[PDB]
Design a protein around this ligand. Structure first.
Ligand SMILES: CN1CCC(n2cc(Nc3ncc4nnn(-c5ccc(F)cc5C#N)c4n3)cn2)CC1
Length: 282
């Protein structure tokens, strides 16, 4: 019951920072999502506020207000209420190719925007992608958004690129592109593309399906895991076509251009939108 504006406070879940509540705005009779934030946390909240406050795109969750002691402009981030998240949608099964393709287009539009603003998403995963099922609108959650320049066991590693498994602190625009490809594959199958228990099993799963076409990358992998490194890494044992058996050639071909081992062969959000597979939303 914090403030006179935000009534009927009901929990929605838990973010990587704090709790999320669902509340009704008293000014306009429309629902909002409020993030409560409980030092090193003070510096981390200051950066997050400055960024998300200046971003406004159709595929980025809208941030309405920044509050503190009960409606004063701990911190409270008031943002738009979305019907559900992608994780919830995919728990009910895979999507029709037309829906996976439409959400991928929106995800890429949202990424092209934040990348253009030199912001990246450090935690791109289906739980951070919000959906309004009637409108078929996908929006990228604000938590995780950062400038390009405790509870560790609870952070998801399944959408991490091979480069991010090898250099865990270095974040780039390309790492978001890998996660976008993993999310697309998951929308089509309903299953996690690479579901490794630890960083070692993860890399082994990717290496079973993704070709290593550069000697620099193969030399780097030979130092980390010599046993599962062959002389010809150009031909995986279980390629992407085998991991997505029911889905179309067009979709697998597009995904093969995103799920590249090296960030230098990978399509940027802008290049992926220009690809004939995405360019169909004129
Ligand atoms: C457990 N499962 C049940 C369904 C649930 N759900 C969430 C919404 N709407 C909604 N709209 C705008 C939001 N902005 N942040 N955020 C979050 C909500 C929960 C959370 F953990 C992290 C974030 C973050 N960032 C938002 N949720 C509708 N249903 C998701 C969690």
């Amino acid at each position: 019951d914090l403030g006179s504006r935000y009534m009927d406070l009901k929990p929605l879940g838990c973010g990587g920072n704090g709790l999320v509540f669902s509340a009704v705005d008293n000014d306009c009779d429309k629902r909002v999502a409020i993030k409560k934030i409980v030092p090193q946390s003070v510096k981390h909240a200051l950066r997050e506020i400055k960024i998300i406050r200046r971003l406004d795109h159709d595929n980025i969750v809208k941030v309405f207000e920044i509050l503190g002691p009960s409606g004063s402009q701990s911190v409270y981030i008031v943002q738009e209420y979305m019907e559900t998240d992608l994780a919830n949608v995919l728990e009910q099964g895979p999507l029709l190719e037309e829906h996976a393709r439409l959400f991928m287009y929106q995800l890429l539009r949202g990424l092209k925007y934040i990348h253009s603003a030199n912001v990246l998403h450090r935690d791109l995963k289906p739980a951070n992608l919000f959906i309004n099922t009637e409108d078929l609108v996908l929006k990228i959650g604000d938590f995780g958004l950062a400038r390009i320049m405790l509870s560790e066991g609870l952070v998801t590693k399944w959408y991490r690129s091979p480069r991010l498994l090898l250099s865990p602190n270095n974040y780039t625009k390309a790492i978001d592109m890998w996660a976008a490809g993993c999310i697309f594959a998951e929308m089509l199958t309903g299953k996690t593309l690479f579901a490794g228990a630890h960083e070692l099993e993860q890399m082994q799963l990717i290496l079973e399906s993704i070709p290593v076409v550069h000697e620099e990358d193969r030399q780097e992998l030979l130092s980390v895991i010599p046993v599962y490194i062959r002389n010809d890494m150009t031909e995986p044992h279980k390629p992407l076509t085998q991991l997505l058996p029911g889905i179309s050639r067009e979709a697998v071909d597009f995904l093969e251009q995103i799920l590249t081992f090296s960030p230098m062969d990978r399509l940027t959000a802008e290049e992926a939108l220009s690809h004939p597979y995405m360019s169909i939303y004129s």
